[PDB]
Amino acid sequence: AIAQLATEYVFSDFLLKEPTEPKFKGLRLELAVDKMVTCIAVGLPLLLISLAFAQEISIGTQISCFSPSSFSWRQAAFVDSYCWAAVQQKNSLQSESGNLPLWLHKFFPYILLLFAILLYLPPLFWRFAAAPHICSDLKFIMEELDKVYNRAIKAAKSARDFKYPIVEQYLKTKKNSNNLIIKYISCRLLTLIIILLACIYLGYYFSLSSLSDEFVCSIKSGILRNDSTVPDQFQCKLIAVGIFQLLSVINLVVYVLLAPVVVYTLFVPFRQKTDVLKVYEILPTFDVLHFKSEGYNDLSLYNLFLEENISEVKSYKCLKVLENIKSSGQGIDPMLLLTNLGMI
Amino acid sequence: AIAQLATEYVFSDFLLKEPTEPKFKGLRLELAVDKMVTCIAVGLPLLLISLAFAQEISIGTQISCFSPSSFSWRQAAFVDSYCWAAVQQKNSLQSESGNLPLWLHKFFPYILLLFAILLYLPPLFWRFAAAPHICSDLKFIMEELDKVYNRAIKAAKSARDFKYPIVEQYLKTKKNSNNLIIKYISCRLLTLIIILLACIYLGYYFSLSSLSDEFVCSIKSGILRNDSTVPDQFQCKLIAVGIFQLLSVINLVVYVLLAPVVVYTLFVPFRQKTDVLKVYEILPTFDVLHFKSEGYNDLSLYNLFLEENISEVKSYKCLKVLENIKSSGQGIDPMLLLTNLGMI
Amino acid sequence: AIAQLATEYVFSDFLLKEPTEPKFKGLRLELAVDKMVTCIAVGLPLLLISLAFAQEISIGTQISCFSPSSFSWRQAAFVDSYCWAAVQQKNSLQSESGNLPLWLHKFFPYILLLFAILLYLPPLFWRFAAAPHICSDLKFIMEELDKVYNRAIKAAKSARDFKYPIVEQYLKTKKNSNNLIIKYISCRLLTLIIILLACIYLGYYFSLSSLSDEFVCSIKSGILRNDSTVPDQFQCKLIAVGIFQLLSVINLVVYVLLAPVVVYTLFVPFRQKTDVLKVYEILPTFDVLHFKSEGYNDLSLYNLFLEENISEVKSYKCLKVLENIKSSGQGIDPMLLLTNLGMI
Amino acid sequence: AIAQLATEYVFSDFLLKEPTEPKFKGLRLELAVDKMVTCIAVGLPLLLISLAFAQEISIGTQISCFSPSSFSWRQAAFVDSYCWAAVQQKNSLQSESGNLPLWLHKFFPYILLLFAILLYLPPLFWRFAAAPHICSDLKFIMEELDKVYNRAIKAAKSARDFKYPIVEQYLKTKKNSNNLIIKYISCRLLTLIIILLACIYLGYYFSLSSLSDEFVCSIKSGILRNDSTVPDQFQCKLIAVGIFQLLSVINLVVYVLLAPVVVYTLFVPFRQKTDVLKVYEILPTFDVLHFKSEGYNDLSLYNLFLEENISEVKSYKCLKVLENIKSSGQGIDPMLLLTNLGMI
Ligand SMILES: CC(C)CCC[C@@H](C)[C@H]1CC[C@H]2[C@@H]3CC=C4C[C@@H](O)CC[C@]4(C)[C@H]3CC[C@]12C
Ligand SMILES: CC(C)CCC[C@@H](C)[C@H]1CC[C@H]2[C@@H]3CC=C4C[C@@H](O)CC[C@]4(C)[C@H]3CC[C@]12C
Ligand SMILES: CC(C)CCC[C@@H](C)[C@H]1CC[C@H]2[C@@H]3CC=C4C[C@@H](O)CC[C@]4(C)[C@H]3CC[C@]12C
Ligand SMILES: CC(C)CCC[C@@H](C)[C@H]1CC[C@H]2[C@@H]3CC=C4C[C@@H](O)CC[C@]4(C)[C@H]3CC[C@]12C
Ligand SMILES: CC(C)CCC[C@@H](C)[C@H]1CC[C@H]2[C@@H]3CC=C4C[C@@H](O)CC[C@]4(C)[C@H]3CC[C@]12C
Numbered sequence A, B, C, D: 001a002i003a004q005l006a007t008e009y010v011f012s013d014f015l016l017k018e019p020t021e022p023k024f025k026g027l028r029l030e031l032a033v034d035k036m037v038t039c040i041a042v043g044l045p046l047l048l049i050s051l052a053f054a055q056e057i058s059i060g061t062q063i064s065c066f067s068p069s070s071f072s073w074r075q076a077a078f079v080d081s082y083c084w085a086a087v088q089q090k091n092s093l094q095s096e097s098g099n100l101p102l103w104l105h106k107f108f109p110y111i112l113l114l115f116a117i118l119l120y121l122p123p124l125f126w127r128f129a130a131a132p133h134i135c136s137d138l139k140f141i142m143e144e145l146d147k148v149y150n151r152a153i154k155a156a157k158s159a160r161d162f163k164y165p166i167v168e169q170y171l172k173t174k175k176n177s178n179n180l181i182i183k184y185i186s187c188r189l190l191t192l193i194i195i196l197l198a199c200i201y202l203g204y205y206f207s208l209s210s211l212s213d214e215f216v217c218s219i220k221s222g223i224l225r226n227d228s229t230v231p232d233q234f235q236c237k238l239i240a241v242g243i244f245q246l247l248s249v250i251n252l253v254v255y256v257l258l259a260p261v262v263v264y265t266l267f268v269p270f271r272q273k274t275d276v277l278k279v280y281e282i283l284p285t286f287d288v289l290h291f292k293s294e295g296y297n298d299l300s301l302y303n304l305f306l307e308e309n310i311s312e313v314k315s316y317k318c319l320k321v322l323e324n325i326k327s328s329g330q331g332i333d334p335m336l337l338l339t340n341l342g343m344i
């Protein structure tokens, strides 16, 4: 039913499932905006496919040819099925709009499924190629941040009663390499191109005259070519073509609204803001150097992933509340850190 | 069946599922009133869609055109399907009420699903954008309250046998920022606007003459335009239009009753009452300062979320019972706290 | 099938599911009588809806109009569907009993579902508004009782080898407030009113002549108004109306039997008997004062909830067996308590 | 539905399920490229089979023979079923394209399923024959790497405050044996051959005239051979043949794109690059000798499997970050290793 389709595709965790494995425990591995874009671009065409053939919206068979009254039920069924299979056969049918509109009307669900698959492909490539590496690197970075926070609080407590910036060096090294950012931009660009092509196709499909679904059909090949009792042609109409056009314009609207989001996603350096690591600069055990901005490198992408999935880090949360309290400046950062006692 | 739909949509945890993740363990992340509003506004139109096409209420096909007796079964089926697809084609049909009523009668389930999706969108945006931040902040606040309660009871026990207000400073800082409250008000306002538009549409749909479902249909395009055996027109009726109007007025009543709730929700500062933190003011380790009221800021929203999901805090429950006992004043707050022995 | 519906709605845990959350572990949060009343009042109309359209009891379509023999199958189907949709349209049909009986016959499942939803609403309001508070308070009370029992047995063992009545003070304070009892009485009263209205409706529906299901139908609007081959009217009958009346009288009987139960529930103070706390009065560490009776206050409701869900408390069970043994008076209460050794 | 098939076969973990057993905990046991190739080559033909007979794309029965009007419904059904079963019987039917096109049109789903099974066979043979051995060997290798890393860090810590290369000897021994690599190459080659044969078949099927689906059928064997009322022949058409050809060309495109991937897979030594063990050469406890390249031996395959599933090793990750930091050369490898403190 329509409501069942809605529950499956919008109100359920459709493509929102976290990786089912212990390797990525709590790691999104995909930005929220990218996940939203993929979920829409994939589950919208599927939802429209399901809707267009819902038991309520669908009168019945997808084509009716209006055989003569003399024709029996199965003769008329032969006519309808023959014309359905003959939309491909150009000789059989003669339609003013041509044969491409008939092809599109017959295979619209296939085309929507193709667009959905093509849009799901780049996210899958990301999740299967560049996701494990970033997951491992980010897990190491979070562990290093937790360890340095613990060491700093232990030092502060000892004072009240190595020291090498490994994480900073690793981030600096990531500043050079750009394979991950190149893959990310390539997959986003392919998604954008697929969306644009889908918009072109949907606009063309919705621009039809709405009468191209009605085509003339001739079961006059073979032994029936010179038969007399059979009329030379029939009036066939492809039902649900109006529904297809409505859903196609809906998908076109959604995709044109979505494309600016993908374009904004492509410009990762601009998105790289609100320095996540700036909060850690007040730790004595952490060097006061952010050095993450203004670069078409994997460092900006790692900064984005950190700003996305750093809320799970207790040390980061503690430092964030310390920073927020520092806005008033009533107290002192080391005193607040010592009082917090948030090692684990 | 009707009962199955009821069980799925009203008697089950439809959209009442808690976040399936360890990050939010026991945190609602959504006020009870907001959750009720979203659940109604989403699962009502879906329930009505399912009901309108239930196997019992539905006689059968959604349109019947009453072809002549001479017409065969599949000729009549062609007529019915053609008219169903031609509700869009204005030339084919001539109805007194126009063609918009026919469009609405055909696509009412789609319109209800659209309203449900549009009403579910703002809650989803909230849960995916502003929910993680408030979850982390509120978890930190609850942990700080538990820790300060433990410290105060330990101090009292030591007396019988830092001290910095970090949580108060954090709340004071939240008094300034307003991004969360702005997002909350924006999503509530969008929900209200969607509800009002849905009410307008449902009122218009229910105001129809009830005879607009009957339209005249002409299969007279193409080779059949000059055919003689076919009548110039047919009498088609869209079945289930009365059911659609009944369910639309039901939804209109529900939404007009719900809109005052959304308006009351918009005025968060008025809702900010029954100070949750007032109970903690009797703790020696906690400063006697509430400072949370009369502000279009995130502080009021945090106060609401606390008053919502603070019952899970054992220290808060203990302080609440101490406060309630203090109404008589027979005993002493520190003595009762020491006797409680409710560290964990 | 009928047996499947029975298993789902009477032999299964339909609305008998305990709260699926760790917050309420073993707490009913709903009295047994109230749960029975809600389960009946909700799952009876749903069961009757399912039964009335069971594949065995149902001959087929819900209306047959007996078109002339000259009419084709789909002409007759048009007639039947038109009349089904025209039960609303007063002009189309002319029935002796009127049009309200036809409306009721068509929408009886909707009306039963409406009554079920309206009866499920007050229980849901209770469980979502006043259940968390009573759950927290009752959990605290049980914990306090366990702690005082442990302290008393420890004192007895020490003798053989604070002391403040916090729980008693909390109960005394609950004696004043009445918001919970007011909500309980309001929800019970609304349930009773809904049940009475349902009884009125079912009595009216069952009082019909049983021939109102037969109505005269006229497909004579539009181009067919002046058509000659079509008869001026048809004889239509709404099938399953007898089944609807039978199930409606069954529901009426059940609801009239149930209403006295709801009225008895409304009088909570009378139900407040068999003092649960009287057993704890023999503990040296517990003050000898019950002070819970004869009040339209939340104290009586808390006493009811205690008498309901106190069997899970080992200390209460031990004290109850001590009390039962004290009926003979052969031994001594402190000696029996010491010998029991039931700390945990 | 189409969307359901898509969710099952592309958006779900179809053939992506990890081995359901504790023996292989986190071990892929199959390269990512090989898994992708198998998943495509298997779930594409299945998806196309499901699509070709979807309730929306399918008009109805797969063959209609257009019996005379005098023929009754079940006479026409006999004709259609007889011709469907007589596509095999060459005498019954006379088609210009022959009888092989009819066989293919009737059994296209069977042929796609056969290709899917044949392509799934080599992966299954691998997973059931050569997977346990490589799993055990690789688990031992990872355990040895973890142990040597722990020993080296312990030695470094002791300095700050056996020694036999068992793993290197085992890898060197693997350099000689080649049974695993021979099995891998054989299964890949069989997969490639199956893909090529499938491409040949699909090209032949798509190269048909598109009118071979129309064949002449004669129910003139037995008592009906000399019957007069029955026409000497009928015009039968195999519906869905156009859909079969479309999906066959789609599968052909996918397989021709995939075959280069399989050919690249066959050349494992070229794939053996980015020495995984080179990072471990900086450990004092590990001998400075990689000795893994330029060989048609199991050593290259083991190197590939290591580069695939070594990210799960904490010691390897630590050494990798040490290597990346060494690019700048600011610090010292032993000092960084000591500071890391990443034993477990
Ligand atoms: C997804 C991508 C590939 C879709 C590409 C656009 C498709 C949908 C449409 C939009 C405009 C279309 C073209 C418009 C006009 C003509 C001229 C005609 O004589 C042959 C077909 C041809 C050349 C059409 C082919 C298909 C076409 C290119
Ligand atoms: C992503 C955005 C830009 C998509 C917007 C849809 C655009 C591309 C659509 C809307 C209307 C469409 C046109 C409608 C009609 C025709 C006439 C036909 O003979 C050739 C294609 C052509 C010229 C279409 C090309 C694509 C088109 C311009
Ligand atoms: C969800 C929102 C967009 C719904 C908006 C209201 C819809 C349901 C209805 C209510 C009143 C309607 C209008 C009433 C009168 C007319 C005048 C007519 O000559 C053209 C259509 C037009 C202009 C209608 C368009 C659709 C309309 C605006
Ligand atoms: C949220 C609340 C205010 C909704 C209440 C429903 C209101 C808006 C409904 C009920 C009846 C409706 C009217 C019924 C009939 C017509 C005549 C038509 O030619 C234009 C629209 C118009 C004038 C409708 C406008 C909207 C309307 C006034
Ligand atoms: C659930 C509640 C609202 C049900 C209320 C009772 C319903 C079922 C029935 C019982 C008696 C009925 C009334 C009996 C007699 C008449 C007089 C007639 O000229 C108009 C309808 C009217 C006024 C009926 C309206 C519906 C009615 C009130």
Ligand SMILES: CC(C)CCC[C@@H](C)[C@H]1CC[C@H]2[C@@H]3CC=C4C[C@@H](O)CC[C@]4(C)[C@H]3CC[C@]12C
Pocket (backbone or CB within 6 Å): C196, C199, C200, C203, C204, C207, C256
């Ligand atoms: C909860 C208990 C009291 C319910 C018992 C059912 C009662 C209320 C039912 C049973 C028979 C019913 C009556 C049957 C027939 C008529 C005649 C009609 O023109 C008006 C309503 C009226 C007068 C009904 C009113 C309600 C009624 C009296």
Ligand SMILES: CC(C)CCC[C@@H](C)[C@H]1CC[C@H]2[C@@H]3CC=C4C[C@@H](O)CC[C@]4(C)[C@H]3CC[C@]12C
Pocket (backbone or CB within 6 Å): D197, D198, D200, D201, D204
């Ligand atoms: C999967 C593998 C086995 C498929 C092999 C190719 C199949 C699909 C096709 C492609 C070309 C075909 C051949 C083309 C021409 C002829 C000559 C004819 O007089 C007899 C059949 C015969 C000999 C065909 C047999 C089947 C054939 C070999």
Ligand SMILES: CC(C)CCC[C@@H](C)[C@H]1CC[C@H]2[C@@H]3CC=C4C[C@@H](O)CC[C@]4(C)[C@H]3CC[C@]12C
Pocket (backbone or CB within 6 Å): D196, D199, D200, D203, D204, D207, D256
């Ligand atoms: C893996 C790649 C190379 C597959 C490409 C498909 C090739 C092999 C296909 C496409 C068109 C096909 C040809 C189409 C028509 C005929 C005529 C027939 O009487 C014999 C087979 C023959 C000659 C086919 C042989 C196979 C063929 C050449």
Ligand SMILES: *[C@@H]1O[C@H](CO)[C@@H](O)[C@H](O)[C@H]1NC(C)=O
Pocket (backbone or CB within 6 Å): A222, A223, A224, A225, A226
């Ligand atoms: C049909 O009859 C015509 C008469 O002109 C002839 O040309 C044609 O070949 C016949 N077709 C068949 C299939 O026998």
Ligand SMILES: *[C@@H]1O[C@H](CO)[C@@H](O)[C@H](O)[C@H]1NC(C)=O
Pocket (backbone or CB within 6 Å): B222, B223, B224, B225, B226
């Ligand atoms: C139908 O016949 C009329 C006669 O006036 C003619 O004008 C029209 O073009 C014909 N239509 C078709 C589709 O042949």
Ligand SMILES: *[C@@H]1O[C@H](CO)[C@@H](O)[C@H](O)[C@H]1NC(C)=O
Pocket (backbone or CB within 6 Å): C222, C223, C224, C225, C226
């Ligand atoms: C039907 O014919 C009658 C004859 O009196 C006429 O008044 C009426 O308008 C006609 N109806 C239609 C719908 O043409």
Ligand SMILES: *[C@@H]1O[C@H](CO)[C@@H](O)[C@H](O)[C@H]1NC(C)=O
Pocket (backbone or CB within 6 Å): D222, D223, D224, D225, D226
């Ligand atoms: C049909 O009749 C013919 C007449 O020539 C005869 O040869 C043939 O054997 C008969 N067939 C059967 C099955 O009786």
